[PDB]
């Protein structure tokens, strides 16, 4: 049960590079591609992410796409860059210009056939195909436009599989680009139709994680991409190791989404704690559960205290009793009952996996479906309405070719998504 990865734009390619470092470390694959692991348990599911190259070697199932090769040359120069198949690097000759319409319509249609050709050659080689995994930012230019184009083409070609996206949403406090609201709104319009499940991460919540929990004096983008890579590599762990209570991406989707538009989720990973404190307190399921539900540990600006949980999922890695998991999830639901949706009789799903991440005795990754998500969209919608009423920068997009009705449709669809979350927050029996 194998996943195919696509990495798009600068943010996506850098996070992907850190992800493939983390995954290659967990399965003991040298940067030359040679298997060097130390237990048969590592080898017996290597197929899930790797294809086999000649004499020993393994190659990672990823497609790299970008509009200017600067990033591609940076990742190829990195320490694990050699592992990647040369034919899998796709790049153009001129930039996206931070413009969604350019990225979607002009260079997009020029390159898009070659990316689908690479994805199909890789997909048709699988003996049974599980969902796709895509990393991109929504605020950029080639990331947003070409990512949503590609998402639409893969959803046309593989409608029976799972479609998964990880996406870094624009922050409310420090923008790097002026036209972020347009690109975000159009991308959310594309995602809510095409995607099956989309995870959203701010840059402000990760900074607050770094400053408060890890007490880092001078964080860098390598740390931010490591935080993202930990959860990304964690969600798939039950696909590829034994355990007492198996789980699957499709099983996650079936248990988390009550209605098909409500598929946007928050992420967290629990045993984050500074090196000085770690000697004074051992890991245990009560401690993990306490960190897991602390809003300090959630990677989205919206805070859970302003919403209610529809559903949540926890995947535990390590050797532990199931009784402790069940009783912890019961006690948290009973003691904090106002923050849990009252019609669903039990909001938490649990899963248990035998193999922890290297150097930790235990770990849990947390996925949450919370109605606080409305706040993030509301901020952008507001910024969009301020910009759109005055035609602030629209001539660039119209000169590329966009009709204004697309902008009004995307605004209406995002506003309806916000309304649907708000309606389910305030529902009652009667």
């Amino acid at each position: 049960r194998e996943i195919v990865c696509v990495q798009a734009g600068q943010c996506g390619n850098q996070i992907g590079s850190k992800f493939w470092e983390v995954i290659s470390d967990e399965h003991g694959v040298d940067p030359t591609g040679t298997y060097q692991g130390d237990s048969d348990l590592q080898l017996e599911r290597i197929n899930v992410y790797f294809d086999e190259a000649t004499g020993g070697r393994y190659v990672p199932r990823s497609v790299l796409i970008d509009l200017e090769p600067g990033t591609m040359d940076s990742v190829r120069a990195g320490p694990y860059g050699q592992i990647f198949r040369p034919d899998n690097f796709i790049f153009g000759q001129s930039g996206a210009g931070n413009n969604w319409a350019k990225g979607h319509y002009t260079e997009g249609a020029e390159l898009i056939d070659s990316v689908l050709d690479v994805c199909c050659k890789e997909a048709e080689s699988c003996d049974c195909l599980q969902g796709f995994q895509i990393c991109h930012s929504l605020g950029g230019g080639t990331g947003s436009g070409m990512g949503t184009l590609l998402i639409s083409k893969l959803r046309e070609q593989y409608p029976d599989r799972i479609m998964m996206t990880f996406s870094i949403i624009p922050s409310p406090k420090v923008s790097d680009t002026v036209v972020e609201p347009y690109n975000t709104t159009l991308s959310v319009h594309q995602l809510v139709e095409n995607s099956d499940e989309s995870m959203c991460i701010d840059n402000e919540a990760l900074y607050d994680i770094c400053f408060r929990t890890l007490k880092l004096t001078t964080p860098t983008f390598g740390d931010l991409n490591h935080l993202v890579s930990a959860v990304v590599s964690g969600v798939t762990c039950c696909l590829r190791f034994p355990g007492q209570l198996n789980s699957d991406l499709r099983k996650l989707a079936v248990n988390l989404v009550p209605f098909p538009r409500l598929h946007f989720f928050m992420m967290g990973f629990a045993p984050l704690t500074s090196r000085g404190s770690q000697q004074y307190r051992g890991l245990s399921v009560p401690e993990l559960t306490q960190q897991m539900f602390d809003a300090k540990n959630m990677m989205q600006a919206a805070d859970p205290r302003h919403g209610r949980y529809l559903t949540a999922s926890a995947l535990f890695r390590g050797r532990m009793s199931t009784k402790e998991v069940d009783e912890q999830m019961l006690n948290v639901q009973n003691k904090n009952s106002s923050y849990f949706i009252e019609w669903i009789p039990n909001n938490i799903k649990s899963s248990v996996c035998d193999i922890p991440p290297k150097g930790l005795k235990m770990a849990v990754t947390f996925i949450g479906n919370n109605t606080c998500i409305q706040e993030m969209f509301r901020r952008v919608g507001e910024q969009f309405t301020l910009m759109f009423r005055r035609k602030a920068f629209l001539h660039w997009y119209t000169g590329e070719g966009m009709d204004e009705m697309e902008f009004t449709e995307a605004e209406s669809n995002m506003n309806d998504l916000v309304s649907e979350y708000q309606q389910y927050q305030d529902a009652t029996i009667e």
Binding site: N246, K251, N255, S321, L330, P345, I429
Partner: protein, 442 residues
């Protein structure tokens, strides 16, 4: 003589591992399917035959199939310690799970895998000369256990007909829970299970956790403990076929004695001398103490209180050094008690069995060694309370069509929910009606 075991999904395969560990150790079959000691003439034994068949070279192989839609659990069996015991055809695995959807298992995916299972069962049933039932282990909370268990029981019931089918079933505990969609799957399972099973024994994990904390001294239990307890119960019930005894009980006698009307076939199970090794040498364990023990609610493996209902029939299994007179004195003392009540149409409420083989002790196990044990399965109207809480959770969720779009997309329409809910409502009314005292004798 022979019985065939069918293991479905994750709970059923994991409980199967404990069962076959126990049955091997009780008969003396090595993990590679061999036999120690002598094999020459002078002595000659047959008790294994109920569960194993021997090859011409003298290897033993067991009468079981392991069925799963995901590979991981059967591949764990294939790479584990018992690799050489099972025939590789018996370990059947699909490509992808039923994703907690009964509809996906029943309609989409199980339809491809079901014919291999039927071919394996046919090949087993042809190598028998006194088959006397099927034993099935599954959980109704998950997708493949519900959907494929129902589909397979329907096909088995058409092909084999009158042969008995006994299910051991794990219901979703009343407040411990593992997945959100458990009520829908349990209702839909119970609709199929009502028509196509002869006796169903009910288990809840919350009860076995309580029993292992209070009686055993285990602070932090895990599934291996529960599975070893289940294995002990199944071994106790099947011991009557395999060893010498004073009062034997054939599997058809269970159905004749326990089931008064053809729908009233759901039974509670409990086991008495669950005790630790340090306590066991401080106390005698006579017949009357364990007979008094099996009726206390602290002994039960299902979360129900029998004081809220009436008993219809009880089946009491004694194994080990017991004398029938002590069993009679115990049953008469139980009968005297005022908090134990039987329906007035069942005057002779008890069936007894007495077998000479004491319960086996497993090297890594947590139970003590004891000279005698008793196991009870009993039919009582209190079980109606267990269904009512699942139905209440179903009604709460179903009021908004909360998850129904998954089920409708994979093929199950919408009417089937209402049909199943009405059938379980009728089962509740059956348990209400059977328990109503007769108004007059004329």
């Amino acid at each position: 003589r022979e019985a065939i075991c069918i293991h479905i999904g994750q709970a059923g395969c994991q409980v199967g591992n404990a069962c076959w560990e126990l049955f091997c150790l009780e008969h003396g079959i090595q993990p590679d399917g061999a036999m120690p000691s002598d094999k020459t003439i002078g002595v000659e034994d047959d008790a294994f035959n109920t569960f194993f068949s021997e090859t011409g070279a003298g290897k033993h192989v067991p009468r079981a199939v392991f069925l799963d839609l995901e590979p991981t659990v059967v591949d764990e069996v294939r790479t584990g310690t018992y690799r050489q015991l099972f025939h590789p055809e018996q370990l059947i695995s699909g490509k992808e799970d039923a994703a907690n959807n009964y509809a996906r298992g029943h309609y989409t995916i199980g339809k491809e895998i079901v014919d291999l299972c039927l071919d394996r069962i046919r090949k087993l049933a042809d190598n028998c000369t006194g088959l006397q039932g099927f034993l099935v282990y599954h959980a109704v909370g998950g997708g493949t256990g519900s959907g494929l268990g129902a589909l397979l029981l329907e096909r088995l019931s058409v092909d084999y007909g009158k042969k008995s089918k006994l299910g051991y079933t794990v219901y979703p505990s009343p407040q411990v829970s593992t997945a959100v969609v458990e009520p829908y799957n349990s209702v839909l399972s119970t609709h199929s299970l009502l028509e196509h099973t002869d006796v169903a024994a009910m288990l809840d994990n919350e009860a076995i956790y309580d029993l292992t904390r209070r009686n055993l001294d285990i602070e932090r239990p895990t599934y291996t403990n529960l599975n070893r307890l289940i294995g002990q119960v199944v071994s106790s019930l099947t011991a009557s076929l395999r060893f010498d005894g004073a009062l034997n009980v054939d599997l058809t006698e269970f159905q004749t004695n326990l089931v008064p009307y053809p729908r009233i076939h759901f039974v509670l199970t409990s086991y008495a001398p669950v005790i630790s090794a340090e306590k066991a040498y401080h106390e005698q364990l006579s017949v009357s103490e364990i007979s008094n023990a099996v009726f206390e609610p602290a002994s039960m493996m299902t979360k129900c209180d029998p004081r809220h209902g009436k008993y219809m029939a009880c089946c009491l299994m004694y194994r080990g050094d017991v004398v029938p007179k002590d069993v009679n004195a115990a049953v008469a003392t139980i009968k005297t008690k005022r908090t134990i009540q039987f329906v007035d149409w069942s005057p002779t409420g008890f069936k007894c069995g007495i077998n000479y083989q004491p319960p086996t002790v497993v090297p890594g196990g947590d139970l003590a060694k004891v000279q005698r044990a008793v196991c009870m399965i009993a039919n009582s109207t209190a079980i109606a309370e267990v269904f009512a809480r699942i139905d209440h959770k179903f009604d709460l969720m179903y009021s908004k069509r909360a998850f129904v779009h998954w089920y409708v997309g994979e093929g199950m329409e919408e009417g089937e929910f209402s049909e199943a809910r009405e059938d379980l409502a009728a089962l509740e009314k059956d348990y209400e009606e059977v328990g109503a005292e007769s108004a007059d004798m004329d």
